[PDB]
Amino acid sequence: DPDTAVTNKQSFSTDVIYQVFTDRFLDGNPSNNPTGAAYDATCSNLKLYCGGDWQGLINKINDNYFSDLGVTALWISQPVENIFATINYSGVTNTAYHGYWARDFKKTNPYFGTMADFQNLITTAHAKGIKIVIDFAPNHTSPAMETDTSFAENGRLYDNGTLVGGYTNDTNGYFHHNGGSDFSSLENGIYKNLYDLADFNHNNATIDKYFKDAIKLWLDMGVDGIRVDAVKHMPLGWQKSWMSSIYAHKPVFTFGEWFLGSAASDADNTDFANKSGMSLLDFRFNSAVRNVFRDNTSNMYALDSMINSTATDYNQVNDQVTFIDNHDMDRFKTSAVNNRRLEQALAFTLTSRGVPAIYYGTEQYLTGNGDPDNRAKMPSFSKSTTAFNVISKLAPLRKSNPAIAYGSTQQRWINNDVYVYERKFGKSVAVVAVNRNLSTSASITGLSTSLPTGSYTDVLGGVLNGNNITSTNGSINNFTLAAGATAVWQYTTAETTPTIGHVGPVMGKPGNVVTIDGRGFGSTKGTVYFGTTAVTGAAITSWEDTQIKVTIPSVAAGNYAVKVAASGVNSNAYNNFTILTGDQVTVRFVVNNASTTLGQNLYLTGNVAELGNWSTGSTAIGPAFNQVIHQYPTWYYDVSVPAGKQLEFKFFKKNGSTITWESGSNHTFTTPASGTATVTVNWQ
Ligand SMILES: [Ca+2]
Ligand SMILES: [Ca+2]
């Protein structure tokens, strides 16, 4: 199938995702609505259920609202059964309308629909070329008070109807009983409760197994992608192990939410995107876009600086999901914000790198500050706004022009209020010019681009005052960019040599199938390379001009560049593919008596690529934790490691450049065939 097909669950680079709160979009079936105090027919009390459901989403796919808007994927609320109880938080009744307070991850939420309704959502969507992404929240169940079992449902978890356990009298240790996080460190936010939400203990092997089994059920139902909630609040090691079981079973595009409040690099956030096996919501792109277009606190140089720095930090910047707002911040539209600034921020997100997501109602200019006002009922299904028109003209370009979906980004002209940038992939080129100044036009002279000689019409057809241009071997004739204008000019052609645009997933064990997307691979099965290893023949499960599916070779675990050769021409290399040693389990490593100096941290390495193959650098594990589950001078860390394998390891202390290793012989441990384990040793 081509890269562009609805069938491509491994890459959303050619898609535009529409993020919807299922409850707030359309009540397509009033008979499944909640009753009593939990429901509000008028939807003016935004903490209660308004009644929106999966039949409502089926209706709008069927009357072409989404196809006309041009979105090609729906990201919906968590589909699983949530608590039924209502919770009174200081006088105001709160419900689980948002989907985040799960109680059974193997059943549907009956207010959104039955399993049959879910299956009908998947079929209807796929028949229209729309992918389905679901929220999944493995960090917690629901609000719970250990001392008061009458509060809410005491965070009880059910396994398809059978009780597994609640937060009070949790003798099995399914949940953490460490109090609530104060968010003072990474560690503190992982092993304590987020507010009053009962925190899962994923080191408990029943819970590990439960979540591997629960996600398999939803993948077997045809979901195309997963948005993981609260990835900052769960151990990276457990999440990498859970990600490797998804990719070994039915690989789908997965991204997480790790909140950031500015456009600055955050080392922990960069590491998570690079090492976990999943990508992230791009809050750094989002802060720069709001600062420049919404709040006027930065100018166009902050936009370009964020483009360069994120392309540098993230190994696969094209896997990061971009947006101008969402469920965690004020709606982009405010009375102080003009419509053209929102339309411009949409035009910029849709033509920039990453996977763009639009929060439902953006095309209707929905307002709302804070939670829950930013989650208002979908106000109209009008197809007439300029915002609607901008998304329907630009979203198709991610499918028809590979420079938008996969290209690099280069600055071509910039000053405080004007930004002109270019996307390029092979011979395809897209150039976007934006003038955010609402009252004065800009005379543009000396612009050079990669557009071939020719004249170019604005893809937006002048709806944002864009103009047409003329290229003479890339030099653009002088023109005036109007007040508030944005114009998009493009050139696509067929690629003749192989060039790789995306590989998904970028982590797996031998035997897993990965998807290579791009252009110019031809119809004749060639060879794929993982480093030096050539993979040919039957190992390549399908080969066409824009997409290859290939089995990962049995080669040593490590970091590899993937390259394709078609008719003796070698492509560009796609870097940083992780091959794992095999199936993964999560092991908690605990080391006693490791005293340290001020500013000295503890790290772990060992003899498999998952522990860094004896390196003391960025592939080593750590720094280890020492506050919540075990306390200094005991340190601990949860690590994804190959299953059923005898491992050798040592801890080491590192303060700057100087490394001090444990003495003696290596510690050894044989990992379990599945699940989790804990190994405790003493510092030598
Ligand atoms: Ca309903
Ligand atoms: Ca947690």
Counting Cα atoms < 13 Å in the Cβ hemisphere of 630 gives: 18
40, 104, 229, 422: the catalytic one is 229
Q: Could you tell me the two tokens for 77? A: 């609320």
**8 A C-beta contact, residue 539 and residue 569:** no
What are the sequence ranges of the domains in the chain?
A: 1-400, 401-494, 495-580, 581-684
**Distance separating alpha carbons of residues 253 and 292, to the nearest angstrom:** 30
Query: If residue 584 lies in a helix (H) or strand (E), which one and from where to where?
Result: strand 584-592
Structural tokens at position 294 = 């919404």
CA 542/CA 524 separation, integer angstroms: 10
CB 80 within 8 A of CB 105: yes
Q: Determine the 3-state secondary structure of 317 from DSSP.
A: helix
Closest CA to 96 of 146, 152, 147: 152
Of 81, 104, 135, 257, the catalytic one is: 257
Q: What's the rounded Cα separation, in Å, for the pair 101 and 229?
A: 12
DSSP string, 587-612: EEEEEE-----TT-EEEEEESSGGGT
SS3 letters for 77-141? Answer: CCCEEECCCCEEECCEEECCCCCCCEEEEEEECCCCCCHHHHHHHHHHHHHCCCEEEEEECCCEE
In what order do the strands lie in the sheet containing 584-592?
Answer: 635-642, 584-592, 676-682
CA of 187 to the centre of ligand 2 (A): 10
Q: Which residues contact 350 (CB under 8 A, 6 or more apart)?
A: 16, 356, 390, 391, 394, 395, 397, 398, 404
CA distance 444 to 620: 50
Cα dihedral sign, 617-239-513-573 = negative
The token duo for 439 is 């009252």
| 371 annotated as belonging to a binding site for a ligand | yes
Which tokens hold the place of 343? 């339309």
Please report, for the chain, how many H helices and E strands are present, in that order. 14, 43
Class of the domain covering 401-494: mainly beta
Phi/psi of residue 660, nearest 5 degrees: -125, 120
Give CA–CA dist 564/577, Å, rounded.
14
DSSP lists the bridge partners of residue 50 as none
In this structure, which residues have their CB less than 5 angstroms from ion ligand 1?
A: 27, 29, 32-33, 51, 53
**What's the rounded Cα separation, in Å, for the pair 181 and 31?**
40
Cα–Cα nearest to 93, from 35, 145, 50, 46 = 46
Q: Looking at the CA of 195, name the nearest ligand.
A: 2
- The CATH class of 495-580 is mainly beta
Terminal-residue alpha carbon distance, the chain: 56
- Strand 162-165 versus strand 92-94 pairing type: unpaired
343 assigned to active site: no
d(CA 613, CA 642): 13
Total number of residues shown for the chain = 684
Contact partners, residue 7, CB within 8 Å, separation at least 6? 1
Q: 498: buried, middle or exposed (CB in 10 Å: 19+, 13-18, 0-12)?
A: buried
Domain 581-684 sits in CATH 3.30.70.100: no
Task: Report the 3 state secondary structure along 631-674.
Answer: CCCCEEEEEEEECCCEEEEEEEEECCCCEEECCCCCEEEECCCC
Both structure tokens of 553: 């070779």
d(CA 271, CA 268): 5
Separation of alpha carbons 619 and 559, rounded Å: 10
**Residue 380 CB contacts under 8 Å (≥ 6 apart), including other chains:** 364
- Cβ proximity of 560 and 516 under 8 Å: no
Question: For residues 54 and 121, is the Cβ–Cβ distance under 8 A?
Answer: yes
* Residue 139 annotated as lining a ligand binding site: yes
Experimentally, how was this structure solved?
X-ray
* Both structure tokens of 579: 């091959």
How far apart are the C-alpha atoms of 656 and 347, rounded to whole Å?
45
Establish whether 195 is an annotated binding residue: yes
Sequence-distant (6+) residues with CB within 8 A of 102 are 78, 80, 81, 82, 83, 137, 141, 142, 157
- Measured on CA atoms in the order 609, 581, 517, 232, is the torsion positive or negative? negative
Got the DSSP string for 396-456?
Answer: THHHH-HHHHH-EEEEEEE-SSEEEEEEEETTEEEEEEEE--SS--EEE-SEE-SPPSEEE
Asked if 401-494 and 495-580 have one fold, the answer is: yes
**Which residue is associated with the tokens 């949790």?**
170
Q: At 185, list the tokens.
A: 């460190």
Query: Residue 629: nearest ligand to its CA?
Result: 2
279 alpha carbon – ligand 2 mean position (Å):
19
By the 10 Å C-beta count (0-12 exposed, 13-18 middle, 19+ buried), 44 is classed as: exposed
| Residue 241 · residue 214 · CB < 8 Å | no
Nearest ligand by distance to the CA of 41:
1
Torsion 318-324-325-329 (CA) sign: positive
Q: Report phi then psi at 293, rounded to 5.
A: -95, -30
Both structure tokens of 110:
């009956």
- The answer to whether 190 is a known ligand-binding residue is yes
Identity of the amino acid at 19 = Q
Q: Is 375 assigned to a binding site?
A: yes
Name the fold adopted by 1-400: TIM Barrel (3.20.20)
Return d(Cα 354, Cα 337) in angstroms, integer: 25
> Resolution in angstroms, to 1 decimal, for this deposition?
2.0
Q: What backbone torsions phi and psi does residue 313 show, to the nearest 5 degrees?
A: -70, -40
Q: Quote the CA–CA distance of 286 and 264 in Å, as a whole number.
A: 11
Cis, peptide link before residue 372, omega less than 30° from 0: yes
Q: Which of 560, 513, 598, 610 is nearest to 246 (CA)?
A: 513
Closest to 24 (Cα-Cα) out of 116, 111, 97, 114: 97
| Ligand 1 centroid from CA 109, angstroms | 11
Concerning whether 153 is annotated as a catalytic residue, the answer is: no
Nearest ligand by distance to the CA of 28: 1
Alpha-carbon torsion, ordered 384, 388, 394, 396, to 10 deg? -90
d(CA 333, CA 26): 22
Alpha carbon of 140 to ligand 2 centroid (Å): 7
